[PDB]
């Protein structure tokens, strides 16, 4: 109807770029490894990718893969909230789209107060929810070239699958050979590496999902499959060198349910470390501050007194007695419930 | 219904005919512009008005006579100091909602930098944000401290040195023109050094003899020119005027009685009446 | 913030009421008659706008400022212990 405000945003599917004629540089120019866009030697300047370092200082991270359909300011606030978990954030900037300044091109810069805070922040990628297009933001430290671990989630999923397979293998070995000593049983268990699934000695999934074999045995539901019995790393080895693993006699259905439960619990553990809360180890916030935080995402309902005027005269009697009395009764009920909550 | 943060709750689900036939004069009080979905005004886009802007309301009486009137926003002219822009910004038109939003954000610079476009509702604010980011990119231009509107346009951004040069050139032209006009209208006139004696009437009897003129300004031509320019700087008087920057300033309304020219029903200016008299807006 | 309910209309202008003229602020320095450092005080918006913020005695109580103060105090305590 009218010119669009920032509430109306549009974006379009990007066709993958194919150089159909490799020698035709005029119509199929090379992409730049820095900007990931077509080289334009006539009207562009070379970029080393470190330019923002001269602007934001050494303690700076570049964030990539930011989604569409969001204001640069909204994304700046969200990124500030996320990166506050690692220290004091001096600044957050989000580059606008070439064709829509209200949207982002997909790049941002975060300037930290402390080198240690920035280095801690760079370690893991940032997984976003569906409302942010499920994007996984990739982080790059400008002062050390350190990058985020974009394969962390899928490597951990593979580790969880390997742990379930290890549990099944050990249960089968116990069912076949009977009770076995720990240091001999553990050497019969193998995992498949990520991503090509090459057989390996099972020692990495255990330490990435549980921290140790004792943790694996003592954490549910594997303690419902196995029972450790007495006849640092040195303590672990010595303690395992004098044990026997005994099985809990289960049926096929119970064992299958237990394996599914173990998978689900490990999945929850994986999601927790990616969705750690942003208020962890921070002071409480006043009600006004919490309302200001909320307003970045949601607007409060408009006052009902203003809203009443929308009742059209064609079918409604504006300011009607029964309608207003209904409003008063609802208000009274809400106040009574609040009083009950207080008491 | 949905969109409970916006006006029209009981219109959202009544039908198409009612929506098209809605009569604006049904709404007595003004609705906030953001919740109504109203286009920002040019004045709002040239100032920082946040939630406030031109609106309308209806007058209804016991006789059931209806009347709709335009109502202007409550705007003040205030000066700000911006560290990000490295300059004082005189006479920005601001509102109470805008001032409260600046308080919430943490000041003028924070309000300009952090506010989303929908809430800011100010193209002038967006341009200020652009200039702040440009100054961040190019600190050396910030050290000049020129008025921020020098770099409002993108071309000035692409050619900063010409922007500063042209700004200074136009400023000097303005200064020279004003100086010449003031000299022309000055109350002190210095005649030529070869004929300083003006025509006089016969001195009244008993008046003491006037001493010979002291022409100290004839020793050097440079001194003569400096003295002549200094004399040209003089002014007859200085006038007082309404200025909101002064604590005791005020403006004027209409006459005490409240009457009007007999037999004349004056029509107020509109966009279809006296629309472009003496200036665009 | 302003409220849009029952505004005053006069002279063709609209003036909106301010039911809540108060805002919370964090005290960065000792202000005689207001509080000590690190306190969250409800002050008047004019007081914040024209005295406290210009003089650098307080700042709006945003989560950013609160967290920055907390982390700075923790760092200062750790610095004391390192010096000892």
């Amino acid at each position: 109807a009218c010119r669009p405000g920032a509430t109306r945003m549009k974006w379009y599917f990007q066709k993958p770029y194919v150089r159909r004629v490799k020698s035709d540089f005029f119509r199929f120019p090379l992409l730049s490894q820095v900007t990931k866009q077509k080289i334009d030697w006539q009207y562009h300047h070379p970029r080393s990718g470190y330019e923002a370092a001269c602007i934001f200082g050494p303690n700076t991270l570049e964030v990539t893969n930011l989604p569409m359909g969001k204001t640069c300011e909204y994304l700046q606030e969200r990124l500030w909230r996320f990166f506050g978990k690692f220290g004091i954030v001096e600044q957050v900037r989000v580059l606008p789209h070439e064709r829509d300044p209200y949207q982002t091109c997909g790049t941002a810069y975060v300037c930290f107060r402390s080198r240690m805070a920035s280095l801690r922040a760079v370690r893991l990628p940032v997984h976003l929810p569906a409302s942010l297009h499920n994007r996984v933001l990739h982080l790059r430290h400008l002062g050390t070239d350190r990058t985020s671990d974009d394969l962390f989630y899928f490597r951990r999923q593979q580790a969880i699958s390997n742990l379930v397979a290890i549990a099944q293998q050990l249960y089968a070995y116990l069912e076949e050979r009977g009770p076995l000593p720990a240091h001999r049983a553990l050497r019969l268990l193998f995992e498949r590496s990520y991503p090509r699934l090459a057989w390996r000695q099972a020692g990495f999934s255990v330490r990435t999902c549980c921290g140790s074999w004792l943790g694996f045995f003592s954490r549910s539901p594997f303690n419902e499959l196995f029972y450790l019995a007495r006849e640092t790393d040195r303590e672990e080895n010595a303690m395992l060198e004098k044990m026997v693993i005994f099985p809990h006699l289960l049926s096929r259905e119970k064992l299958q349910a237990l394996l599914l439960r173990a998978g689900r619990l490990l999945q929850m553990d994986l999601q927790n470390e990616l969705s750690v809360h942003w208020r962890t180890d921070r002071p409480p916030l006043p009600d006004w501050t919490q309302k200001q935080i909320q307003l970045w995402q949601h607007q409060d309902p408009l006052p009902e007194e203003l809203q009443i005027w929308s009742r059209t005269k064609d079918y409604y009697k504006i300011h009607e007695e029964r309608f207003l009395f209904k409003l008063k009764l609802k208000k009274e009920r809400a106040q009574a419930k609040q009083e009950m909550k207080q008491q | 219904p949905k969109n409970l943060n916006l006006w029209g709750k009981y219109l959202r689900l009544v039908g198409r005919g009612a929506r098209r036939g809605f009569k604006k004069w049904q709404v007595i009080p003004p609705i906030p512009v953001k919740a109504y979905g109203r286009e920002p005004s040019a004045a709002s886009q040239t100032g920082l008005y946040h939630d406030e802007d031109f609106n309308y309301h209806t007058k209804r009486t016991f006789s059931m006579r209806r009347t709709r009137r335009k109502i202007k926003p409550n705007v003040f002219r205030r000066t700000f100091t911006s560290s990000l822009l490295n300059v004082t910004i005189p006479n920005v038109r601001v509102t109470t909602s805008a001032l409260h939003a600046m308080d919430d954000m943490g000041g003028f610079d924070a309000y300009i930098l952090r506010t989303p476009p929908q809430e800011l509702r100010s193209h002038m604010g967006e341009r200020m944000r652009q200039v702040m980011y440009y100054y961040q990119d190019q600190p050396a231009i910030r050290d000049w401290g020129l008025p921020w509107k020098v770099f409002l346009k993108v071309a000035s951004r692409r050619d900063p040195f010409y922007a500063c040069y042209r700004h200074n050139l136009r400023k000097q032209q303005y200064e020279a023109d004003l100086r010449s006009r003031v000299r022309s209208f000055s109350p002190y006139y210095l005649p030529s050094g070869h004929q300083p004696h003006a025509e006089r009437q016969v001195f009244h009897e008993g008046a003491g003899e006037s001493p010979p003129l002291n022409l100290w300004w004839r020793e050097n031509r440079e001194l003569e020119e400096a003295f002549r320019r200094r004399l040209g700087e003089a002014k007859c008087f200085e006038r007082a005027f309404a200025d909101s920057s002064e604590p005791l300033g005020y403006t004027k309304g209409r006459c005490r009685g409240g009457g009007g020219k007999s037999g004349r029903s004056v029509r107020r200016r509109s966009k279809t009446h006296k629309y472009r008299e003496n200036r665009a807006f | 913030a302003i409220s849009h309910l029952n505004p005053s209309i006069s002279k063709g202008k609209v003036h909106y009421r301010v039911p809540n003229p108060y805002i919370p602020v964090l005290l960065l320095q000792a202000v005689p008659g207001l509080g000590k450092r690190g306190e969250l005080k409800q002050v008047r918006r004019g007081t914040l706008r024209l005295f406290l913020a210009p003089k650098g005695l307080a700042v709006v109580a945003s989560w950013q400022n609160i967290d920055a103060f907390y982390l700075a105090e923790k760092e200062e305590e750790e610095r004391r212990r390192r010096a000892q």
């Binding site: 409480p284 006043p286 009600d287 006004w288 | 909101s244 002064e246 604590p247 005791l248 300033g249 005020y250 403006t251 004027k252 309304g253 209409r254 006459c255 005490r256 | 002279k11 009421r17 301010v18 039911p19 809540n20 003229p21 108060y22 919370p24 969250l40 409800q42």
Partner: peptide, 28 residues
């Protein structure tokens, strides 16, 4: 309004100058 001062002297009994400082945390 023949005389229209920019600053109007504040009223003593207006609710604006007498409103309560409110509370930081509602729960306590």
């Amino acid at each position: 309004s023949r005389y229209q001062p920019f600053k109007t002297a504040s009223e003593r009994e207006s609710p604006f100058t007498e409103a309560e400082p409110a509370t930081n945390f509602a729960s306590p």
